[PDB]
Curated annotation (Swiss-Prot):
InterPro entries: Glyco_hydro_13_cat_dom, Glyco_hydro_b, Glycoside_hydrolase_SF, Ig-like_fold, Ig_E-set, Maltooligo_trehalose_arc_C, Trehalose_TreZ, Trehalose_TreZ_E-set_sf. NCBIfam families: trehalose_TreZ. The active site is at D249, Q280. This is Malto-oligosyltrehalose trehalohydrolase. Homodimer. It comes from the Archaea. GO terms for molecular function: 4-alpha-D-(1->4)-alpha-D-glucanotrehalose trehalohydrolase activity. It is found in: Cytoplasm. It is an enzyme of class 3 (hydrolase). Keywords: Carbohydrate metabolism, Cytoplasm, Glycosidase, Hydrolase. It comes from Saccharolobus solfataricus. It catalyses: hydrolysis of (1->4)-alpha-D-glucosidic linkage in 4-alpha-D-[(1->4)-alpha-D-glucanosyl]n trehalose to yield trehalose and (1->4)-alpha-D-glucan. GO terms for biological process: trehalose biosynthetic process.
Amino acid sequence: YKIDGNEVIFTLWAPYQKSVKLKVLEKGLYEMERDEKGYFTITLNNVKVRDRYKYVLDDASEIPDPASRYQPEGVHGPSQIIQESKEFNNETFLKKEDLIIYEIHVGTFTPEGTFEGVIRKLDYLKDLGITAIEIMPIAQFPGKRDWGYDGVYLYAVQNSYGGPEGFRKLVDEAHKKGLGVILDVVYNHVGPEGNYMVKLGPYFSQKYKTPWGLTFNFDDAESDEVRKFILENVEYWIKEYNVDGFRLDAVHAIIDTSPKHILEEIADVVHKYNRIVIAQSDLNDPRVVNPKEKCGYNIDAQWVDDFHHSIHAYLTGERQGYYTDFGNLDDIVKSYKDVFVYDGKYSNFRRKTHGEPVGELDGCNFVVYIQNHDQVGNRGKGERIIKLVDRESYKIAAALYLLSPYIPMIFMGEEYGEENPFYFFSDFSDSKLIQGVREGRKKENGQDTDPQDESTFNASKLSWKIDEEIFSFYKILIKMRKELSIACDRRVNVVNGENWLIIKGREYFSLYVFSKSSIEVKYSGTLLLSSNNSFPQHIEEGKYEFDKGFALYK
Ligand SMILES: OC[C@H]1O[C@H](O[C@H]2O[C@H](CO)[C@@H](O[C@H]3O[C@H](CO)[C@@H](O[C@H]4O[C@H](CO)[C@@H](O[C@H]5O[C@H](CO)[C@@H](O)[C@H](O)[C@H]5O)[C@H](O)[C@H]4O)[C@H](O)[C@H]3O)[C@H](O)[C@H]2O)[C@H](O)[C@@H](O)[C@@H]1O
């Protein structure tokens, strides 16, 4: 819908439909006029915020507005008219070279499980050194318990998180504290419950499908309208909620053979309104991130799993699934200097040559992490890395990524040493999908906890039990990164022995000692931070026997 003067225009694209009627609940039924493209319209003057409505098809069946702005009674309920105050800055104050990102799942972040709960934690975040919070998908999904990827109304803010009013309040309060908010958005697929688009028109591609459902139709018959549906959604989040940027989910599963890729158009919209796009890419292909004059889509940055996988595989000893492609120290050094480990070499996991070198692109085109919702939650027992490595290793892992040239992303709780698992949970009502989720998560991930069980969700809620030694470590790590101008700068010299490595930057050098060993140090410097007490306040060029641990020098 779109509120005009005192009247409001209802627009519904439904080419499969002969005639649709608007059903305002406390008022009457209204016949909609049809144009040749398949668009249904009526201007109504009696409608006010916040009335409920549905659409009634040729079927006589009643469905919610697929472009709904609020879904008060969940996915199968009516839609609701909200206020459309388009207050937005023309500029985000976020500078992407200064980006430290904190990933939040609203539902489990705090006892509240709401936007109000993340608001309460803003000062804490600000004080930690974070510059931006990344919110997992908030587009309305079934029930109350879901990561967000089963979202099924792109324009509707999850009711159980606190809806539109609560999200607007979150972003306003974040700006007041000087924090940015990045929104996780899903344009590659749609959730398996509460989607009614398939009855309206060819929203989905017949060409291929994702592991999580059918993909959107971007390059085939009638795709103009669906391109518009997605592109106006990124416009909507910017103008109606004043969001600072986006994390685009699974861009490798957004397939488009058009002259201009939809991903380039997505980035075009966000840069038109001076915002930021990060992409989750499995492609290891610099085209996602390259400038337009270099045949790229010009996304600001992309997740580099290769960085995480190098660290995890090496420190845990783990080789199951995608970890089989990693495990050596070499991999960490490779990722530290060439970004991708798979830059056009053969992957045993994928059984094909994978990737492409990244060129002279600086570090702030990439985001790295040792933990996130996937690397924790797709484990059958959902164990955080804190459970798989010793204390020393954990701090070594934290130092590696936070002191890297790339944009670092902290996973909620990681910073204070959270020990609670993060499980996969869902809240479907359809018995077939309740059947499929359990058996699928059992088979694919080895998950023994029931995703549909409430306890699986409750067990994933952060404890907020502060380990002060870990927290102080992160706090200083973040501080020193800013102070040492580590951001974006790929000019690093890395040396490695069997059980250790030294990384030297322009203003610092770091010692990463994985086992007691004798190391030749080529640099002088004063101690900034350390995982131990075993490290000297002042070090000079020479040979030293170090115990397991990390040290940072100026
Ligand atoms: O191949 C090497 C890489 O492998 C991984 O990456 C892939 O999988 C990731 C995790 O699934 C993807 O990440 C993102 O995309 C998905 C989907 O949006 C999302 O996945 C989560 O949510 C879905 C949807 O609920 C869930 O799907 C299952 O359950 C539903 C409900 O029953 C069912 O319909 C599906 O059939 C089930 O499969 C997933 O289980 C859950 O993981 C994820 O959260 C997003 O971040 C990547 O895009 C994709 O490449 C690995 O993550 C990489 O690190 C490896 O490099």
